[PDB]
Amino acid sequence: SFPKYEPSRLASLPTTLDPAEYDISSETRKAQAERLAIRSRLKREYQLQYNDPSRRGVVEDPALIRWTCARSANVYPNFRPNTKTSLLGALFGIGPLIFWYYVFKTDRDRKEKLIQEGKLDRTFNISY
Amino acid sequence: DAPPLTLEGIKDRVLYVLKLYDKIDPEKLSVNSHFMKDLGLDSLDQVEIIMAMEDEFGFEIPDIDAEKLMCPQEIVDYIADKKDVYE
Amino acid sequence: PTLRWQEDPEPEDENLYEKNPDSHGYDKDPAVDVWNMRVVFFFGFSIVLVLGSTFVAYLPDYRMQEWARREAERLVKYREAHGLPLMESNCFDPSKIQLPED
Amino acid sequence: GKRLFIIKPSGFYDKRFLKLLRFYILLTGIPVVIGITLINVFIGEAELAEIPEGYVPEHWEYFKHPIS
Amino acid sequence: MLKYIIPTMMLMPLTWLSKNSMIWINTTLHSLLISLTSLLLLNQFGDNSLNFSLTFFSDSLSTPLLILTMWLLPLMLMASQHHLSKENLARKKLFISMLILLQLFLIMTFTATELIFFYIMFEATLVPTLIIITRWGNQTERLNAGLYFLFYTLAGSLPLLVALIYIQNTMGSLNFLILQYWVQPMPNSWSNTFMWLACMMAFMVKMPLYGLHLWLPKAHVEAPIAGSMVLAAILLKLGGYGMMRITLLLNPITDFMAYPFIMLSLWGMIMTSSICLRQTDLKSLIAYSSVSHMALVIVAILIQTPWSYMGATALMIAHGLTSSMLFCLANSNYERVHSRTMILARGLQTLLPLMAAWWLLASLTNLALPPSINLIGELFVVMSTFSWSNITIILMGLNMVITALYSLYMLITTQRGKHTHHINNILPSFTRENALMSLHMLPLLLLSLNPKIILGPLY
Amino acid sequence: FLPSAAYLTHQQKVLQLYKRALRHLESRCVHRDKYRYFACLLRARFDEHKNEKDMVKATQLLREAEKEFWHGQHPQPYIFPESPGGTSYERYECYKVPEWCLDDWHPSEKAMYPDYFAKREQWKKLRRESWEREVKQLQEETPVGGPRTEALPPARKQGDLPPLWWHIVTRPRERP
Known part of the structure; x- marks a missing residue:
């Protein structure tokens, strides 16, 4: 009835039609059961940290602190200079700068030679 | 912005709109009457019932709770919980 | 079989409330907190803020402004009265000059 | 039996700070504004007179407003 | 201005021999006395500076910055309790006297005749902030932050001294007035380019320019609040002040060798305003915000227009006020949640119903809402740069859009919509924090009424 | 993805598709009488095959039902204006x-x-x-x-x- 709805980098493929869900095996049900058990145990520990009358401060999330330290200062290691990293850094660092520097060479040459001649609208051009 | 509700009145409304339905009977109809167990009707009509409750009371009940009510008492209790109506 | 440390689990949430809920922002001495209220709400807002606002509301002619207004009025009145063009170019004397000639 | 206790966070600290702020701008706002009103209702600014024949005045008395 | 210098020397030992529970009121009261005393100076009339035997003078390049520093000192100080309250009385006196010494050398730095004395007081500004941020930085890399700070500021600022000794023994003494009166252009040789590159490069590192701005963000995330505000406002605007002082000499070659620096600052302004959109660590957003605004300042300084210099000093004063305030609110939030991370601390609309009004007002001054002096600065710089090249206005407006975007995103992310219902320890906001808010913003609006003071010497 | 178990069932998936398809027909089909007609047509379509003892036939017809449903869904369905997605969605979270x-x-x-x-x-x-x-x-x-x-x-x-x-x-x- 339809070309079966390809996804993209933006178009979300919903969990209605995968269609690869329907070939369930026993190990996939074991995987879903283990996933359910992991979220069960983490929520149990969360609720037991969460329900004391004597607790005053924050809930002390380790996952957020993990993500922040892994994103802030645990980027510089690890790192290696590849062809990909070096070429992509040289293409995103000095490329646009040398591009707009060429266009400002062009526009400054035009402005210099133009008012060098005298064919500008500076009958009054006061606010220098 | 103030319609108030009650327990007895909203239970009478839910029992009313269950009594309105065609292929069940008002003969043996009460609050302690299971749908799939001893009224014999399908789960399909049971979800038509939950559809009627949503379409009247104006709020979606979740699809996890379109599964396991099966009786008018828990329906009235769940609607009173979602609307937070006690004194 | 190892610990690497000895120190105590410290500190705690020493709430500045739950003892003195009337009290202001900083530490536990309930007289000098009122003294700090007095000094930062009389010497930051009362004697500094509105006094500085009225000081900058009028001070003398900063960068000679109203002097420049009235002097320009009188000079344009002069150069209307004598018929010469107002604001002649060559602010320096066109005779008092020495061009490096070829 | 219908009415319900609404739950607000607090009012005391906020209204206390803004009370102290309005009263302590008002503390030396009334004397300054009333005093400058007394200045421009009693003492006057100045006149636009000119330098006479052979006289040298102060480096003040070149200004309009008297408090200036 | 020795009547400003000697009360600072007569304020320091008082704090040393102040008794217990009495250090605070003495220091605060006497710094406010210094603030009225600072307000007395504002007298700069017309044609010349206001001079004073050899060492001292005042311009509107220096007078609002000096008033900014001495107004900032009690605000600095009253931010600087409750996070060293349980520490020793002797260490508390040591910290406060260190800040007083730092203020003293800053007044020395802004009221300087010779550029040699300016260099001495420049690295005198450098030294105490090191000890402050490295001792009390309260994270595991305050070490690294202080070390990057000291090595970039020395290693950039150092050949500036040799160029200044060269200008000394080629033109006689180094008064700013003689250098107004004995200057002569130095044409496009190579050594002229090297001397200009050394001086401007030292100041570039102090700004920071985009090539060497990794200097800043560690030193902002890993500092106490007093040193944070000092570092950002007074050190970056001191660098711009020093560039405005030195650029009166060496005019004819900046048209030949300013084209890389203007380009680097523009594209780095766009990249920095983009990078402070998507980071974590809420403190650091204002750090790269300051980087973006000082890049705009650098473009304004080097395109050499009177409109540009008036807008430059306006943008300096406005961003100093706004960034100091917004650092203080960030310290308030870190007092609340003990996090520094952005996505954790949420809600704060139900809770704290008027602290949010100061967050809103700060983010609107950052956004360039039109009575904010930020907008006066940005507007004059935009006028001057469109006179400079007639096509670079697109980078300016793209900066404008992204600037409003990240500032308002920083507002609505943490502070619009839903508490996480596990924080449950915030108290309603103290009168001290609100006092620092109304000490920041009331002079900003009352300066926004009659702002003819803060514009530059090209009034 | 649910707090009770991991697998829903075949019946639970069929039923959730039934509720979603009927809600989409509600959204397509105003004046409510043609809705009653088409809704009982849909109920007839699912009682075409009550006697299904097979399993692969049932799940393949379910996949074709997902195809024929995604072929004809509605872009802005009538979602209830207190539910998530709807017009309220913690509208009065001003005082929670x-x-x-x-x-x-x-x-x-x-x-x-x-x-x-x-x-x-x-x-x-x-x-x-x-x-x-x-x-x-x-x-x-x-x-x-x-x-x-x-x-x-x-x-x-x-x-x-x-x-x-x-x-x-x-x-x-x-x-x-």
Whole structure:
């Protein structure tokens, strides 16, 4: 009835039609059961940290602190200079700068030679 | 912005709109009457019932709770919980 | 079989409330907190803020402004009265000059 | 039996700070504004007179407003 | 201005021999006395500076910055309790006297005749902030932050001294007035380019320019609040002040060798305003915000227009006020949640119903809402740069859009919509924090009424 | 993805598609009488094949139903304006002030509301009063080496309140 709805980098493929869900095996049900058990145990520990009358401060999330330290200062290691990293850094660092520097060479040459001649609208051009 | 509700009145409304339905009977109809167990009707009509409750009371009940009510008492209790109506 | 440390689990949430809920922002001495209220709400807002606002509301002619207004009025009145063009170019004397000639 | 206790966070600290702020701008706002009103209702600014024949005045008395 | 210098020397030992529970009121009261005393100076009339035997003078390049520093000192100080309250009385006196010494050398730095004395007081500004941020930085890399700070500021600022000794023994003494009166252009040789590159490069590192701005963000995330505000406002605007002082000499070659620096600052302004959109660590957003605004300042300084210099000093004063305030609110939030991370601390609309009004007002001054002096600065710089090249206005407006975007995103992310219902320890906001808010913003609006003071010497 | 189990069932998936397809027909099909017609046509379509004893036939018809449903869904369905997605979606979250607060008030403001604060104090005494033995013994007795579920059983053993109840009972009223 339809070309079966390809996804993209933006178009979300919903969990209605995968269609690869329907070939369930026993190990996939074991995987879903283990996933359910992991979220069960983490929520149990969360609720037991969460329900004391004597607790005053924050809930002390380790996952957020993990993500922040892994994103802030645990980027510089690890790192290696590849062809990909070096070429992509040289293409995103000095490329646009040398591009707009060429266009400002062009526009400054035009402005210099133009008012060098005298064919500008500076009958009054006061606010220098 | 103030319609108030009650327990007895909203239970009478839910029992009313269950009594309105065609292929069940008002003969043996009460609050302690299971749908799939001893009224014999399908789960399909049971979800038509939950559809009627949503379409009247104006709020979606979740699809996890379109599964396991099966009786008018828990329906009235769940609607009173979602609307937070006690004194 | 190892610990690497000895120190105590410290500190705690020493709430500045739950003892003195009337009290202001900083530490536990309930007289000098009122003294700090007095000094930062009389010497930051009362004697500094509105006094500085009225000081900058009028001070003398900063960068000679109203002097420049009235002097320009009188000079344009002069150069209307004598018929010469107002604001002649060559602010320096066109005779008092020495061009490096070829 | 219908009415319900609404739950607000607090009012005391906020209204206390803004009370102290309005009263302590008002503390030396009334004397300054009333005093400058007394200045421009009693003492006057100045006149636009000119330098006479052979006289040298102060480096003040070149200004309009008297408090200036 | 020795009547400003000697009360600072007569304020320091008082704090040393102040008794217990009495250090605070003495220091605060006497710094406010210094603030009225600072307000007395504002007298700069017309044609010349206001001079004073050899060492001292005042311009509107220096007078609002000096008033900014001495107004900032009690605000600095009253931010600087409750996070060293349980520490020793002797260490508390040591910290406060260190800040007083730092203020003293800053007044020395802004009221300087010779550029040699300016260099001495420049690295005198450098030294105490090191000890402050490295001792009390309260994270595991305050070490690294202080070390990057000291090595970039020395290693950039150092050949500036040799160029200044060269200008000394080629033109006689180094008064700013003689250098107004004995200057002569130095044409496009190579050594002229090297001397200009050394001086401007030292100041570039102090700004920071985009090539060497990794200097800043560690030193902002890993500092106490007093040193944070000092570092950002007074050190970056001191660098711009020093560039405005030195650029009166060496005019004819900046048209030949300013084209890389203007380009680097523009594209780095766009990249920095983009990078402070998507980071974590809420403190650091204002750090790269300051980087973006000082890049705009650098473009304004080097395109050499009177409109540009008036807008430059306006943008300096406005961003100093706004960034100091917004650092203080960030310290308030870190007092609340003990996090520094952005996505954790949420809600704060139900809770704290008027602290949010100061967050809103700060983010609107950052956004360039039109009575904010930020907008006066940005507007004059935009006028001057469109006179400079007639096509670079697109980078300016793209900066404008992204600037409003990240500032308002920083507002609505943490502070619009839903508490996480596990924080449950915030108290309603103290009168001290609100006092620092109304000490920041009331002079900003009352300066926004009659702002003819803060514009530059090209009034 | 659900708190009870992991697999829904074949029947549960069929039923959720039934509710979603019927809701989309409600959204397509205003004046409500042609809706009643087409809805009973849909009910007829699912009672075409009540007698299905096979399984691969049922799941393949279910996949073709997902195809024929995604071929003809509606872009803005009538979603109920209190549900997530709808027009309210915590519209009146202007006053859902959490209830760990109303304990940091000034004592004159606490003198304004005496009896409610006495009752809240005795509720809080009830909260700390019955935490230790009941909740610790249930949360060490009933869990297996993995907890492996999320719905939790009550304190059906001997006495007082079921465990883990404070931030589930004392939520705001959804009309503040």
